[PDB]
């Protein structure tokens, strides 16, 4: 879980993910672990975006998180 989270942080905090490296990461770790790493990365990204959004809607990274999820 530690290693998969380490890789999935690099995956999440990026745009236009290369399918080859993503598929290699998926194959490397177990299904349970892949899903758990995705959940951890998304939760931490949303928490960071909300913390940076303390003032309000100004400089919203939530749109960036949604864009990464769509990608």
The technique by which this structure was obtained is cryo-EM
If phi over 0 gives left and psi between -120 and 50 gives alpha, with beta otherwise, what is residue 42? alpha
For residues 19-36, b (16+ Cβ closer than 10 Å) or e, as one string?
Answer: eeeeeebeeebeeeebeb
Alpha-carbon 12 to chain mean position: 3
User: What is the structure's resolution, reported in angstroms to one decimal?
Assistant: 3.2
State in Å, rounded, how far the first CA of the chain is from the last one: 23
């Amino acid at each position: 879980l530690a290693e998969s989270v380490t890789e999935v942080e690099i995956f999440g905090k990026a745009t236009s993910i290369d399918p080859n490296t993503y598929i290699t990461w998926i194959d490397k770790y177990q299904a349970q672990l892949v899903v758990l790493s995705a959940q951890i990365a998304w939760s931490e990204n949303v928490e960071t975006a909300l913390s940076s959004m303390g003032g309000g809607g100004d400089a919203a990274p939530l749109h960036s998180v949604l864009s990464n999820v769509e990608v």
